Design a protein around this ligand. Structure first.
Ligand SMILES: *C(=C)C1=C(C)[C@@H](Cc2[nH]c(/C=C3N=C(/C=C4\NC(=O)[C@H](C)[C@H]4[C@@H](*)C)C(C)=C\3CCC(=O)O)c(CCC(=O)O)c2C)NC1=O
Ligand SMILES: *[C@@H](C)[C@H]1/C(=C/C2=NC(=C\c3[nH]c(C[C@H]4NC(=O)C(C=C)=C4C)c(C)c3CCC(=O)O)/C(CCC(=O)O)=C2C)NC(=O)[C@@H]1C
Ligand SMILES: *[C@@H](C)[C@H]1/C(=C/C2=NC(=C\c3[nH]c(C[C@H]4NC(=O)C(C=C)=C4C)c(C)c3CCC(=O)O)/C(CCC(=O)O)=C2C)NC(=O)[C@@H]1C
Ligand SMILES: *[C@@H](C)[C@H]1/C(=C/C2=NC(=C\c3[nH]c(C[C@H]4NC(=O)C(C=C)=C4C)c(C)c3CCC(=O)O)/C(CCC(=O)O)=C2C)NC(=O)[C@@H]1C
Ligand SMILES: *[C@@H](C)[C@H]1/C(=C/C2=NC(=C\c3[nH]c(C[C@H]4NC(=O)C(C=C)=C4C)c(C)c3CCC(=O)O)/C(CCC(=O)O)=C2C)NC(=O)[C@@H]1C
Ligand SMILES: *[C@@H](C)[C@H]1/C(=C/C2=NC(=C\c3[nH]c(C[C@H]4NC(=O)C(C=C)=C4C)c(C)c3CCC(=O)O)/C(CCC(=O)O)=C2C)NC(=O)[C@@H]1C
Ligand SMILES: *[C@H](C)[C@H]1/C(=C/C2=NC(=C\c3[nH]c(C[C@H]4NC(=O)C(C=C)=C4C)c(C)c3CCC(=O)O)/C(CCC(=O)O)=C2C)NC(=O)[C@@H]1C
Ligand SMILES: *[C@H](C)[C@H]1/C(=C/C2=NC(=C\c3[nH]c(C[C@H]4NC(=O)C(C=C)=C4C)c(C)c3CCC(=O)O)/C(CCC(=O)O)=C2C)NC(=O)[C@@H]1C
Ligand SMILES: *[C@H](C)[C@H]1/C(=C/C2=NC(=C\c3[nH]c(C[C@H]4NC(=O)C(C=C)=C4C)c(C)c3CCC(=O)O)/C(CCC(=O)O)=C2C)NC(=O)[C@@H]1C
Ligand SMILES: *[C@H](C)[C@H]1/C(=C/C2=NC(=C\c3[nH]c(C[C@H]4NC(=O)C(C=C)=C4C)c(C)c3CCC(=O)O)/C(CCC(=O)O)=C2C)NC(=O)[C@@H]1C
Ligand SMILES: *[C@H](C)[C@H]1/C(=C/C2=NC(=C\c3[nH]c(C[C@H]4NC(=O)C(C=C)=C4C)c(C)c3CCC(=O)O)/C(CCC(=O)O)=C2C)NC(=O)[C@@H]1C
Ligand SMILES: C=CC1=C(C)[C@@H](Cc2[nH]c(/C=C3N=C(/C=C4\NC(=O)[C@H](C)[C@H]4CC)C(C)=C\3CCC(=O)O)c(CCC(=O)O)c2C)NC1=O
Ligand SMILES: C=CC1=C(C)[C@@H](Cc2[nH]c(/C=C3N=C(/C=C4\NC(=O)[C@H](C)[C@H]4CC)C(C)=C\3CCC(=O)O)c(CCC(=O)O)c2C)NC1=O
Ligand SMILES: C=CC1=C(C)[C@@H](Cc2[nH]c(/C=C3N=C(/C=C4\NC(=O)[C@H](C)[C@H]4CC)C(C)=C\3CCC(=O)O)c(CCC(=O)O)c2C)NC1=O
Lengths: 164, 184, 164, 184, 184, 164, 164, 184
C-alpha cells in the first residue's frame, strides 16, 4: 500500500538494507505533513454523504442525457449506484489522506476502473465532472485549513488524472 | 505491505466506511520522533547485536560449532550470521512502519518449513532471537550495560523520559515474539 | 546517489508514476531535518583536519604494532596515506550530511573497500577504531546541537557497520 | 541519479574538498515548500497539459494527422501522447530533485537517435515541448488564463510572493529547453 | 489440442485401426457452415454476453458488490469480467473445433484449485456461466429478446431451419456444462 | 497483417515448416469466401461517404449533448473530424473485406484508440452508436448478398467489440 | 494435432483473440477440401492391407539384400514387422486425410523415427522406397478422384520429405 | 508480413483511399487453385530440390568440399543444406502469399552482410539458388526431365493448360531472382 514509510521500506528491502538516514528523514515528512492530511481526513470523513451528494448532483446537472431511458442514470438502481461510486472515490481519497500516499486509491479505485466502465458502457466524463466539481468546491479555512485543502485537492486531481 | 495507517484503512474498508477515529493515529504521530530514535538505535548497533546474539546462542550451545553442528563448517556459520541480520532487518522494518505486515509477509511466511527442510535448529534460532529482543530493548531505552558491551558500548543521547519509551520497547519486543512464535 | 528525493524518484520511475503525495511528503522530511544535518556538515567541513587527525591518532594509539617495520603505519608514505584515508571517510560523511542519504559513502567509500584492504593487507580494525573514536567523541551542545550530533553519530555508525 | 545537493557533492569531490558554502544550500532548503507546490502544480495538471500540448502541435500542422503524417493512424497518435507524458514526467522528476541528471540519464540520452530511426519529426516534437514549457510556467505562477483553459481552469491557492516563484519558473523552463536541446 | 476429426483418429488409434465410417464425419462437414454461423454468433456478441452475464450474476447476488464481496473493489470486478471473457473464449474455441480438448487442457485444468486458493466463490462463477449458456443458445438460434438486450440487440440473419441448429445449441451448452462440472 | 495466408505462414515459420496440407486447405477457404467479401468491399468502396454519413447522423441524433459548447461535436472542426473518424473506421472495414482478416482494423484502427479518446476526452458511446447503426442497417439481398452482409456485419461487430 | 482449425485456434489463443473473420474463412477451406481427402481416406481405409502389401513388396524388390541372413527382412518376425511398419505409415496417412493436416504423421510416425531406426540399425532407404512406390502407383480416376489423389500423394511426399 | 491483398490495401492507405479496382484481385482468386498447385509442387519436392541444388553447386565447384572450402567439413555441409532449405522455404511462403514481403523481411534483410561476416561465398550460394529456380519452374510446369531426376522423378498430375502456369513460373522465378539480387 504506497505511503512514505512503505515506499522507503520497499526500496531498502530490494537493496537488502537496514533503515538509514534518508529513510528516517522521509518519515519525518509524515510527522510534519500528517496534521494537514489527518485534518482533511476528519473533515471529509465527518461529511462524506453531503460532499459526494453535491458532486453527484453536479455531474447529472452537466449530463442530463444520463436520465433518458437506457442511459446510466435512468433508473433508481443506476441512480443509487452512481452516487455510491462517487462516495467510493471520496472514501478512498479519505483513506489516502489517513495513509499519506495514493495506495488505497491505486489498489481499490484506479486498478480495473477502465475495464469496468468500458464493459458496462459507463461514460467516464461524469466521473471526471463529479471529481472536478469536488476539486473546484473547497476553500480554506471555511472547510478545512489551507494545507489540509492542498492535500484534499491533490488527491482529487490524482483521481481526475487517472480517468483523463 | 501495510503500515500503522493503512492497517486502520484495511479495518475501515472491511465495512466500506470512512476511518472514524484518527486520535490513535494522532498519538502515533506525537510518538514519531521517539520511533525514529528507536529504529536508529537498532540500525546503528545492528552489526554488534547480530554478532553478539549469534555468539551468545553458540556460547550456550557448543554442539553448534562441532562436527554435525548447524554452525559448522564456515559456510554454515556465515549463513547463520546472514539469517540473524535478515530477521533483525525485518523486525526493524516492522518497527519503522508500526505493523508486523512486512515481517509476516516477507520473512516469517514459510520460514519454519524452510528451516525444517534445511535442518536449521528451532531452539538455537529462537535463542538468538531472544538475545536480539533483549539487546533491542536495551538500545531503545539507551541503557546498555558495559558488562555486556565492553569497549563496543554506544550511547544515543536522545532526550530522556522516565518510561524510557516503554511502549516502543513492548512493541519492538512483540515483533521479536512473533518470530519466536512463527519458528517454535 | 541515495538521498530522500532520489529514493522516491527511483520508486516513482520503476512504476511509471508522476511525483505524488508520498513523494512530496518524503521531501518535507528533508526540509525539516536539513537544519540538524547541514549544521553538522558546516562544523565537520570547517574542522575536518583536526577531527580526522585525532581519529587517526586514536587508531595508532590503540594499535602501536602498526608502527613496527613492515606494518601498515611503518614509513612516512604509509602514515600520510592512513591519515588521508581517515580524512576521506570523514569527508564522505560530510557529503552524506549535505545529501541527507548514504549515497556518497556507499558509492565512493564502502563499494570495493573490502577487496582493496584484502589486496593491500590493510587491517580493518584500525579503520573501525578511527571511526569508533570519532563516534564516541562528540558531545552536544559543545561541538554542535543534539540533533546535529545524532545525524553525525548515525553516519559514523553506518561507516562502522560497513566494516563490521 | 543526482539531486541539487549531490550535484554540489560531485563538484566538491572533483577537487577532494569538503562542500564549502553550506549557507547557500540552507537557501535552497528555504525555497523547499514552493518547490513542492511547483511540482504539485505540474503533476496535478499533467493530463490537461499533455493533451492540450499534443492538440496544439497538431492544430498548427494538420500534416501530422493525414496519410504519411507521424500522428496517423491511431497507433502513432497514441505513441506521441505517451511520449509527451514520458517527457513531462522526467521534467517533473528533475524539478523535484533540483537537477537534470535523471532527465539526462533516463529520458534524453539516445532520444535523438531513437526518433531519427523511427522517423519521428523533430520540429513537431519541439513545438509540443514548447507549449508544455509555457503551460508549466503559468501553473507554477498559478496564473493560467481562462482563454487557454476554459472549464478545465485550475487554481492552486499557494501563499503569494511578488515574483510568483520566478526562479522555479526559470529552472523548470531550462528543463524543457534541455529536452529540446537533446533533439539536436 | 484435438478437433472432432482428430478425436475420431485417437479412438481408431486406440485399436491401431483405420477410421472405418467417415459418414458421421461427412455429416460434421455438411453441418460446417451452421457451425461457423454459431461461432460467428457468439464471437460477434462476446463483449455484450460477458458484461450482461457478470451483471446478471451480481443482479442475483448483491453480496459480490458489498463489503468483503468477491467483485469488490474495482480490481476484483475487472478480474471477474476478465475470467468471463477467458471462459467464453475457450468455450468458443471448443465449438469451432467440435471437441472440448482445448477447453479442458488450457482453461479447466487446475481452475477449481486456483479459485479455491483465491477465495473466488463457486456459486457465483457457476451462475455467470449458466447465463452465458442461455445467451449462447439464443444467439445460435438467432432469437435474442429486446427485453434482455435493449439498444444492444443483434440479429445475425442466418438461413432459418425448423430445429434452429438444436444440435449445435446442445453441443455449445455441454461445453458450458463442462466448465460447471470442473468447478463443482 | 492478419489474414488467412499470413496466419498459416506465421504458424509454419514459428515451427520451421514448409506449407503443408492444412496451410493449402486454409487458403482454399480464402478462395471460397473471396466472392462474398469482395462484393461487400466494392459496395462499401463505391458508397463509403453515404454509408458513413447516415452512421455519423445516427450517433449525433442519439447524443445531441455533443452539440453543446465545449463538447465533442460542438464546432465545425470537431464535426468534420467526427464524420472523418466514422469514414476512417468504414475505410478500415473495407480494407478488412479486401484482405479477409482484421489486420487493417487491428493495426490502424484499434491499436491506441483507447489511449487517444481518453487523452482528448472523446466519449466512446457515439463511436459505438455510429458502428451499431451501420451494423443494424444492412439487409440482404437488398444491399448485397446474404454472405456479403455476414462479412460486413462481422467486421462492424469486431470494431464495436474493440470499444466495448 | 495440426489441422486447419487447431492452427487458427493456437494462433488466436497466443494473441488472446476470439475466433475472427480469417479463422472462420480458414475452416471453410476444410469444408471445401473435405470431399477430396475424405474420399481418399475411405478408399485407403477400405484397401489398407493390399496398398501397404504392394509398397512393402516394392521396397524389398529394390533391396533384396534385406532377405540375406543377418539383414532387417531376413526372418519371419522381421518380415511381419517391416510390413506392419509400412501399414503404420499408410494408417497415419489415412488419419491425416481424415484430419486435413499432418498432426497424426508428425506426432505418431515422424517424431523419434530417426532415433528408432538408428538404434535398431534399420536403413531408411526401404521406408523411402515403400512410400515412393505408393506415391508413384496411384492414378485418377481408377483409384479415386483427381483431387483425392492430390491429397493422398501430398501426404506420401510429406512422409518421404521427413525421411529425406 | 503482407500478402497480395494487404499490399493493395497498404497502397490505398498511402492516399487514405478505398481500394478502388478489385479486378486484378479477382483474377488473383481465379488463379488461386493453380497457385496452391504451384506451392504443392515445390513443398512436395523440397528435399530432392535442396539436395540436388547443393550437390549441383558442389559438382561444379569441388573447391567447396576440400581443405579451406566452405562446405568442409561435415558441419559446414550440414549448415549449407540448412540454408538451401531455409531460402526455398521463404521463397515458397512468398509464392503462397503472392508477395515478396515475407522473404525480404525474414530471410534477405542482412543476409549478404551475414554471409560476408561468416565468409560464406555469395557466388556459390547464388548458383545453388539458380538450380532451385530451374527445379521450381520445371515442377510448377510439371515437366521435370527423367535425365535430371532418374528414380526420384515425380509428376503432380494437375489439370494441363498449354502455357503451363507461365505467370506463376515467372512470379516464382522473380522471388529466386530477389535472393540472387540481394546476394550479389
Ligand atoms: C439484472 C437485473 C439482470 C441482468 C443484467 C440480466 C441477465 C440475464 N441475461 C439473460 C439472457 C440473455 N442476455 C442476452 C444478451 C444479449 N443479447 C443481445 O442481443 C446482445 C448482443 C447481448 C447483450 C445484452 C441474451 C442473448 C440472452 C438470452 C435470452 C434472451 O435473449 O432473452 C439471462 C438469462 C435468462 C434465461 O435463462 O433465459 C439473465 C439472468 N437479467 C437480470 O435480471
Ligand atoms: C554489542 C556488544 C552491542 C551490545 C549487545 C548487548 N548484549 C546484550 C545482552 C546479551 N548478550 C548475550 C551474549 C553474551 N553472553 C554470554 O555469556 C556470551 C558468551 C559466553 C555472549 C556472547 C547474552 C546472553 C545477553 C543477555 C540476553 C538476555 O537477557 O536474554 C544487551 C542487552 C543487555 C545489556 O545491555 O546488559 C546488549 C545491548 N551492547 C552494546 O552497547 C553494543 C553496541
Ligand atoms: C526512546 C526511543 C528514547 C527516547 C526518545 C525520545 N526522542 C525524543 C525526541 C526527538 N527525537 C528526534 C530524532 C528523530 N527525529 C527525526 O526526524 C530523526 C531523523 C531524521 C530522528 C532520529 C527529534 C528530532 C526529537 C524532537 C526534538 C526534541 O524534543 O529534542 C523525545 C522527546 C519527545 C517525546 O516525549 O516523545 C524522546 C522521549 N527517550 C528515552 O528516554 C529513550 C532513550
Ligand atoms: C510558486 C511555486 C508559488 C508559490 C509557492 C509558495 N508556497 C509557499 C509555502 C508553502 N507551501 C506548502 C505546501 C508544500 N509543502 C509540503 O510539505 C507539500 C506536500 C507535502 C507541499 C505541496 C507549505 C506547507 C508551505 C509553507 C506554509 C505556508 O507558507 O503557509 C510559499 C511561501 C514560502 C516560500 O517562499 O518558499 C510560496 C511562495 N507562491 C507564489 O507566489 C506562486 C503561486
Ligand atoms: C530431385 C532429383 C528432383 C528434381 C530436380 C531437378 N533438377 C533439375 C535441374 C538441375 N539439377 C542440377 C544438378 C545436377 N547436375 C549435375 O551436373 C550434378 C552433379 C554432377 C547435379 C547434382 C543442375 C545443374 C540442374 C540445372 C538445369 C537447368 O539449369 O535447367 C530440375 C529442372 C530441370 C529438369 O527437370 O530437367 C529438376 C526438376 N526433379 C525431380 O523430378 C525430383 C523430384
Ligand atoms: C501450374 C501451377 C500447373 C497447373 C495448375 C492447375 N490446376 C488447376 C485447377 C485446380 N487445382 C486444384 C488443387 C488445389 N486447390 C486446393 O484447394 C488445393 C489444396 C488444398 C490444391 C492443391 C483444384 C481444386 C483445381 C480446380 C479443380 C478443377 O476444376 O478441376 C488448373 C485448371 C484451372 C485454371 O485454369 O486455373 C490448372 C491449370 N496446370 C498446369 O498446366 C501446370 C502443371
Ligand atoms: C542461525 C541463527 C541459525 C542457522 C541458519 C542457517 N540458515 C541457512 C540457510 C538458509 N536460511 C534461509 C532463510 C533466510 N533466507 C531468506 O531469504 C530469509 C527471509 C527472507 C531468511 C530468514 C534460507 C532460504 C536458507 C537456504 C539458502 C542459503 O543457504 O542462503 C543455513 C545453511 C543450511 C545448510 O545449507 O546446511 C544455516 C546454517 N544455523 C544455525 O545453527 C542457527 C540456529
Ligand atoms: C562534552 C562536553 C564532552 C567532551 C568534549 C570535549 N571535546 C574536546 C575536544 C575536541 N573535540 C573534537 C571533536 C569535535 N570537534 C568538531 O569539529 C567535531 C565534529 C565536526 C567534533 C565532534 C576536537 C577536534 C577537539 C579538539 C579541539 C577542541 O577542543 O575543539 C574537549 C577539550 C578537551 C579534550 O581535548 O578532550 C572536550 C571537553 N569531553 C567530556 O568530558 C564531555 C563528556
Ligand atoms: C509526439 C510529440 C511525437 C511522436 C511520437 C512517437 N513516438 C513513437 C514511439 C516511440 N517513442 C519512443 C521514445 C519514448 N519511449 C521511452 O522509453 C522514452 C524515454 C524513457 C521516450 C521518450 C520510443 C522508444 C518509441 C518506439 C516504441 C513505441 O512504439 O512506443 C512513435 C511511433 C513510431 C512508430 O512505431 O511508427 C511516434 C509516432 N510522433 C509525432 O508526430 C510527434 C512529433
Ligand atoms: C431490408 C429490406 C431492410 C431495409 C433496407 C433499406 N435500406 C434503405 C436505404 C439505405 N441503406 C443504406 C446502407 C446500405 N448501402 C450501402 O452501400 C451499404 C453497404 C455498402 C449498406 C448496408 C443506405 C446508404 C441507404 C440510403 C440510400 C439507399 O441505399 O437506398 C432503404 C430505403 C428506405 C430507407 O432508407 O429506410 C430500405 C428499405 N429496411 C427495412 O425495413 C429492412 C429491415
Ligand atoms: C550453402 C548454399 C552455402 C554455405 C552456407 C553456410 N551457412 C552457414 C551459417 C549460417 N547461415 C546463416 C543464414 C541462415 N540462417 C537464418 O536464420 C537464415 C534465415 C532465416 C538463413 C538464410 C546464419 C545466420 C549462419 C550462422 C549460424 C549457424 O551456423 O547456423 C555456414 C557455417 C559457417 C561456419 O560456421 O563456419 C555455412 C557453411 N556454405 C557454402 O559453401 C555454400 C555456398
Ligand atoms: C487550436 C488548437 C490550439 C490548442 C490546442 C491550444 C494549445 C496551446 N496552449 C497554450 C497555453 C496553455 N495551455 C494551458 C493549459 C491548461 N490550463 C489550465 O488551467 C488547465 C489545467 C490546462 C489544460 C487546458 C496553460 C496553463 C497554458 C499557458 C498559457 C495560459 O495559461 O494562458 C498555448 C500557448 C503556447 C505558447 O505560449 O507558446 C497553445 C498554443 N492553442 C491552440 O490554438
Ligand atoms: C486459462 C485460464 C485462466 C482463467 C480462467 C483465469 C483464472 C484466474 N482468475 C484470477 C483472478 C480472479 N478471478 C476473479 C473472478 C470472480 N470473482 C467473483 O466474485 C466472480 C464469482 C468471479 C468472476 C466470474 C476474481 C475476483 C479474481 C481476483 C481475486 C483476488 O485477487 O482477490 C486469477 C489470479 C490472477 C489475476 O489476478 O488475474 C486467475 C489465475 N486466469 C487464467 O489464466
Ligand atoms: C467464413 C464464414 C462463414 C460463415 C459464417 C458460414 C455462413 C454460411 N452459413 C450457411 C448456411 C446455414 N446457416 C445456418 C445456420 C442457422 N440457421 C438457423 O436456423 C439458426 C439461426 C442458425 C444456427 C447456427 C443454416 C441452417 C444454414 C443452411 C444449411 C444447413 O442446413 O446446414 C452457408 C451456406 C449457404 C446457405 O445455405 O445459405 C454459409 C456460407 N460459412 C462460412 O464460411
Amino acid at each position: 500500500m504506497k505511503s512514505v514509510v512503505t515506499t522507503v521500506i520497499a526500496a531498502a528491502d530490494a537493496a537488502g538494507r537496514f533503515p538509514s538516514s534518508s529513510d528516517l528523514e522521509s518519515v519525518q515528512g509524515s510527522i510534519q505533513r500528517s496534521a494537514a492530511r489527518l485534518e482533511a481526513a476528519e473533515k471529509l470523513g465527518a461529511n462524506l454523504d453531503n460532499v459526494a451528494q453535491e458532486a453527484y448532483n453536479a455531474c447529472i446537472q452537466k449530463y442530463p442525457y444520463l436520465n433518458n431511458a437506457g442511459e446510466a442514470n435512468s433508473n433508481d438502481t443506476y441512480k443509487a449506484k452512481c452516487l455510491r461510486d462517487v462516495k467510493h472515490y471520496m472514501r478512498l481519497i479519505q483513506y489516502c489522506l489517513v495513509v499519506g500516499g495514493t495506495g488505497p486509491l491505486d489498489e481499490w479505485g484506479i486498478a480495473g476502473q477502465r475495464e469496468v466502465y468500458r464493459a458496462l458502457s459507463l461514460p467516464t466524463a461524469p466521473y471526471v465532472e463529479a471529481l472536478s466539481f469536488a476539486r473546484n468546491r473547497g476553500c480554506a479555512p471555511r472547510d478545512m485549513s489551507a494545507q489540509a485543502l492542498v492535500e484534499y485537492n491533490a488527491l482529487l486531481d490524482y483521481a481526475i488524472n487517472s480517468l483523463s | 505491505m501495510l503500515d500503522a495507517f493503512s492497517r486502520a484503512v484495511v479495518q475501515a474498508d472491511a465495512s466500506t466506511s470512512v476511518v472514524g477515529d484518527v486520535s490513535a493515529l494522532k498519538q502515533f504521530i506525537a510518538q514519531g520522533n521517539r520511533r525514529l530514535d528507536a529504529v536508529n538505535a537498532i540500525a546503528s548497533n545492528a552489526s554488534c547485536m547480530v554478532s553478539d546474539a549469534i555468539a551468545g546462542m553458540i556460547c550456550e550451545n557448543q554442539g553448534l560449532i562441532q562436527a554435525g553442528g548447524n554452525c559448522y563448517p564456515n559456510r554454515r556459520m556465515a549463513a547463520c550470521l546472514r539469517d540473524g541480520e535478515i530477521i533483525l532487518r525485518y523486525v526493524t522494518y516492522a518497527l519503522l512502519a508500526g505493523d508486523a505486515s512486512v515481517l509476516d509477509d516477507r520473512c516469517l511466511n514459510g520460514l519454519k518449513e524452510t528451516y525444517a527442510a534445511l535442518g536449521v535448529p528451532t531452539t538455537s534460532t529462537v535463542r538468538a532471537v531472544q538475545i536480539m529482543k533483549a539487546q533491542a530493548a536495551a538500545h531503545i531505552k539507551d541503557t546498555p550495560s558495559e558488562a555486556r558491551a565492553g569497549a563496543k558500548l554506544r550511547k544515543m543521547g536522545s532526550p530522556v523520559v522516565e518510561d524510557r519509551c516503554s511502549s516502543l520497547v513492548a512493541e519492538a519486543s512483540s515483533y521479536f515474539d512473533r518470530v519466536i512464535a512463527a519458528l517454535s
